[PDB]
């Protein structure tokens, strides 16, 4: 009989079995049967300029490392918002109702790169 442990790929079936190998789609089917490719569906690699970049894939061997201190939400908040909140509270202009001026986003549906829905691949 046929195998069962082997993977069921597109090479193991008839002509009518044309299964994808995992690549993402890049368009749809047009009018006369051709494939219409959508430009926005094709990823655009945002590659920076490395001409003046003074860093290398390897570090110096004598360079010391540091104690592992993974970044947490508490540390990020202390670094980005705690000084501003403290200064505003000392000044007396602090407004608990409005926090959008401090980087807080009440709703993610407005901006481009959303965090919980994860609108961006990488």
């Amino acid at each position: 009989g046929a195998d069962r442990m082997s993977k069921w790929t597109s090479k193991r079936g008839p002509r009518t079995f044309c299964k994808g190998r995992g690549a993402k789609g890049t368009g749809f089917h047009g009018r006369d049967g051709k494939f219409v490719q959508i430009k926005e569906m094709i990823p655009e690699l945002v590659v920076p300029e490395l001409a003046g970049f003074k860093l290398k894939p390897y570090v110096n061997y004598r360079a010391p490392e540091g104690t592992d201190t993974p970044l947490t939400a508490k540390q990020l908040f202390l670094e980005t918002a705690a000084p501003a909140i403290e200064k505003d509270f000392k000044a007396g202009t602090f407004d608990p109702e409005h926090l959008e001026k401090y980087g807080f986003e009440p709703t993610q549906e407005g901006k481009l790169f959303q965090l919980y829905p994860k609108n961006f691949p990488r």
Binding site: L55, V59, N60, Y61, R62, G103, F104, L112, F113, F120
Partner: protein
């Protein structure tokens, strides 16, 4: 990368993925299990690079420097003390280079020696008032410094020259992170001036 080993694996002073170990034990072998006394990481006081003395064997009372330790079989090996002689250069019609290799030894046969009186002592772990855990001898009552040993890579930080593809120490240790509330994507877009006005539509998740 790491190699996987069967539970019925015997350690023979050879790298598990090495050709010699592969030829000694093929992937289809499962030998009898040897009894190994359970010694924890907090009670293993025999390190690599320290001077030790030999209790029993042909070289009774001789002292040597530890060169390797195998925690799986509780083995400690010293350089050129407990030795058997073997030929390494073997050909069809020539032989030579008969070198003395050395057999492993157990923790019950090897005990640490303090550098003060050079006499055998028993090592017990103690907690210092400075927050450090250093081995303290009991026969004499002195601390034994950690035997710093060179790593297997073979390079010492004191003499290192940067290649074309190595960062300088100042560049590697330079701090340029500004902890704001923007994603890497948003920061890169702002830095490179990529302007995007239109936004995503409603997407249902289920």
């Amino acid at each position: 990368s790491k190699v996987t080993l069967p539970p019925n694996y015997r350690y023979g002073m050879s790298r598990p993925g090495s050709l010699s170990d592969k030829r000694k034990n093929p992937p289809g072998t499962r030998r009898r299990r040897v009894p190994v006394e359970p010694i924890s990481d907090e009670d293993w006081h025999l390190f690599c690079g320290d001077k030790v003395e030999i209790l029993e064997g042909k070289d009774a009372g001789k002292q040597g420097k530890v060169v390797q330790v195998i925690r799986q079989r509780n083995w400690v090996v010293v350089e050129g003390l407990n030795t058997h002689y073997r030929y390494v250069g073997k050909t069809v019609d020539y032989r030579g280079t008969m070198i003395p290799s050395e057999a492993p030894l157990l923790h019950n046969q090897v005990k640490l020696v303090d550098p003060t009186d050079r006499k055998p002592t028993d090592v017990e772990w103690r907690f210092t008032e400075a927050g450090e855990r250093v081995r303290v001898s009991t026969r004499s009552g002195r601390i034994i410094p950690k035997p710093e040993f060179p790593r297997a890579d073979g390079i010492v930080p004191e003499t290192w020259i940067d290649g074309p593809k190595d960062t300088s120490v100042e560049d590697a240790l330079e701090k340029t992170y500004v902890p704001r509330l923007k994603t890497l994507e948003e920061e890169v877009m702002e830095a490179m001036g990529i302007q995007e006005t239109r936004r995503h539509k409603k997407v249902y998740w289920y």
